[PDB]
Amino acid sequence: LTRSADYLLDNVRIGNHRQRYDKYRRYVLLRSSEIFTSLVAIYAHIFSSYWQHFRRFTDQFQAPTGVQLPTFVARVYISTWLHDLYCSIREATRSISPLAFNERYSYELLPYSTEYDPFLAFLSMSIKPTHIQHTPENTLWIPILCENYDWDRNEANHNPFGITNFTLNSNLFYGLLAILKERKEFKLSTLTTNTIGRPCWLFDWHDNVQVCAWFPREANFNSQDVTAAYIIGVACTPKLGPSDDDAWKYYASLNSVPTFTPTEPRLTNRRSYGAYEVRTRETENNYFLPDSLLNIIEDFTVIRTKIRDWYYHSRVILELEDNSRTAALRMFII
Amino acid sequence: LTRSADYLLDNVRIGNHRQRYDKYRRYVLLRSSEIFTSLVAIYAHIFSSYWQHFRRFTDQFQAPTGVQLPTFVARVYISTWLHDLYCSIREATRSISPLAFNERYSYELLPYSTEYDPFLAFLSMSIKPTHIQHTPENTLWIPILCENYDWDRNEANHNPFGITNFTLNSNLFYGLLAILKERKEFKLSTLTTNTIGRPCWLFDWHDNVQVCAWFPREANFNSQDVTAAYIIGVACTPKLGPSDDDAWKYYASLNSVPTFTPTEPRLTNRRSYGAYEVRTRETENNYFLPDSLLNIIEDFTVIRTKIRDWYYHSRVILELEDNSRTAALRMFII
Amino acid sequence: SSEIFTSLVAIYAHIFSSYWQHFRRFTDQFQAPTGVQLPTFVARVYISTWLHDLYCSIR
Amino acid sequence: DWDRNEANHNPFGITNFTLNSNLFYGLLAILKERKEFKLSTLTTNTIGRPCWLFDWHDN
Amino acid sequence: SSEIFTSLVAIYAHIFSSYWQHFRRFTDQFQAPTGVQLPTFVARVYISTWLHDLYCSIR
DSSP states (O other), rough: HHHHHHHHHHSTEEEEEEOOOOEEEEEEEOOHHHHHHHHHHHHHHHHHGGGGGGTTTTGGGSSSSSSHHHHHHHHHHHHHHHHHHHHHHHHHHSSSSSHHHHTTTTTTOSOOSSSSOHHHHHHHHHSSSEESSSSOOOEEEEESSSSOOOOSSSSTTTSSSSSSSSSHHHHHHHHHHHHHHHHOOOOOOOOOOSSSSEEEEEEEOOSOOOEEEEEEEETTTTSSSSHHHHOOOOOOOOSSOEEEEEEEOOOOOOOOOOTTTTTTTOOSSSOOOEEEEEEEEEETTOOOOOSSSHHHHTOOOOEEEEEEEEEEEEEEEOOOOOOHHHHHHHHHHH | HHHHHHHHHTTTSEEESSSSSSEEEEEEOOOOOOOHHHHHHHHHHHHHHTTEEEEEEESSSSSSOOHHHHHHHHHHHHHHHHHHHHHHHHHHHEEEEEHHHHHHSOOOOSSSEEEOOOHHHHHHSSOOOOOESSSSEEEEEEEOOOOOOOOOOOOOOOSSSSSSOOOOOHHHHHHHHHHHHTTSSOOOOOEEEEEEESSOOOOOOOOOSSSSSSSSSSTTTOOOOHHHHHSSOSSOOOOOOOEEEEEEEEEEEEEOOOOOOOOOOSSSSSOOOOSSSEEEEEEEEEOOHHHHHHHHHHHHHEEEEEEEEEEESSSEOOOOOOHHHHHHEEEEEE | HHHHHHHHHHHHHHHHHHTGGGGGTTTSSSSSSSSHHHHHHHHHHHHHHHHHHHEEEEE | OOSSSSGOOSSSOOOOOOOOOOHHHHHHHHHHHHHSOOOOOOOOOOOOOOGGGGOOOOO | OOHHHHHHHHHHHHHHHTTGGGGGGGGGGOOOHHHHHOHHHHHHHHHHHHHHHHHHOOO
């Protein structure tokens, strides 16, 4: 059936058509403050495990409040890593998608360090303009640390992103880097200058422990990205996966039945399915009717319409005429 | 980081869990009435350009009311091919998915032919239970010719599906097969005995020639399937792709604006995207209100819930806790 | 393209009618419009298709 | 004056322009199997010949 | 920078129109600002991007 296929392809009759180009750039805002706290909490314990090498170094500093000194050290460490993560994303967007560089990453910063522990040097490698394949849209996701970046040159009051306990201290950071370098138990790796990241920061984090991949495992991730998502025990991005929601139910008083895992009676029948599914339920306890039913009842004291956006992987047939159908059948069966 | 991943895989923390098995069965109802019409129309053309070879054999039969003899011969040919396609799908579902055999294809027919032209043989090879990979749900789509069949043994009265001009005729069919066999113009092909088909019949057909694939091209189809779908110039199934539904808009009477492919504004934002997208609108003429909302209007002389069903490819993290996070981090940075 | 069509139809109907035994059984299913002989009608169809394809050749 | 209806297509101003797919392809098959009639594949040149460019006068 | 722009847009719209069977489906997603044709729209975007990048190359 390849002669008919080739004949339909020589004309533009059929093909592989898409409306988006291959690595279509999508910005996605990182959490950047939940990640921060998760990492600070995971690193304060590592530091406390070997605190006999930091108890003298930290005698020069004073913690802001009842925060312990290992948490202070971890906070400064992670704030510096975030500061440098901005810069690593910025240099990655220069070789891939210069438009993201022009619109979101134009401000220049040099990184405090080129060496971090093997894990933060792994997320530095991963949280980058990552590429996802074999989903309906072939996308290049660009991580965004913040929408408006609030830069500053005095690095004592410097808090570019809106993180709460963000603290830059070059004295603390560089003393701690010397400690981690001279100690035989701590290992430091240099940051890799790659351009494409890994999906370790894109999984969807749901109710109990339900972390679920909205993209195929093949060509996307290899269980080392699930490990990095595991050590960051929180979501790195908002929910980006597909959802098949039903119609709205309305209630006068807050008699709303709790969302039962016994599968509360959904109104509409399901349309799309996956191998793993999570059922949720959103609420709106003060929703005002959309200004049209109000009109209708006001002249009472209805026509419904809905926009559907069917998204696909590609368009396969471009121009259908009977003569080409008959010619393709004729060169096949004659 | 592979040591940490093996640690998180021996202790079963991360994984590849799915709630649905690999070739998950899904019945999809075939058109079989539009397919029949378009196949008859495209085969009457190939028969009338070679009518000297069929004119003397078909002088003994009479077309029913006002049908031309090529159209009548094509109707008989296509009706017999559909009869045998039932049996192809039945014997394919017997082996794989024996429960769909028991509940959809229990009735036994005997096939009239093991030999058709190359294209009807290709379609017999393709409209078996197709396997679709790399969509959120790894699926096995099973074509259903009809929900109910209305069997009977009278050959001249048999219409096992709801097709208007379905005509079985044994003498005509076997004389026609003999003619196609001895004419060197026409090819014949033995029907294969495969069990998994091809997605030729599964594309989504929209208002224009906008025929689009809701599955990746890699591992699914190869543009011989696009050709086979092209020769059948109609939709073979209902629309199976995903759509990003908007919120309903309300109007008093039929005063709605026309639909704008120039993108009239949609109420909600966008959540899911494809490389190709088709925007449609669904009008509902007679919709009163939810009866609870009517109760609210009467009590007037608001709360709103909605069930969201997120679907994914797998569940990647099974059991999360800080002891395992700390262990898998320590074994990477110490 | 109107004089060419007429003269080509006229000179091809002659070649078709001297070999009409080979086209008689195939063309019994079609009907010529008003008073056209079947060789002339077949030549008209042939020449109209050739002109259709000549457009594409020049394009 | 284009249009897609095959039985109504008359892309030029010719009176008896008649397109017919079944007739054309059956006729081509006949010309192909009859050893009397020759067939030729259309070339893919780009410059023609002046066969059509001469000046025709009253005689 | 604006006479050059128009000269280049006009010269490239013709190149694009010569092979428009490969852009007629791609440009179905866009809408031209005014009575400007779609090959001119494609050429305008092409040349504007080239000018944008020409700044950078001179820089």
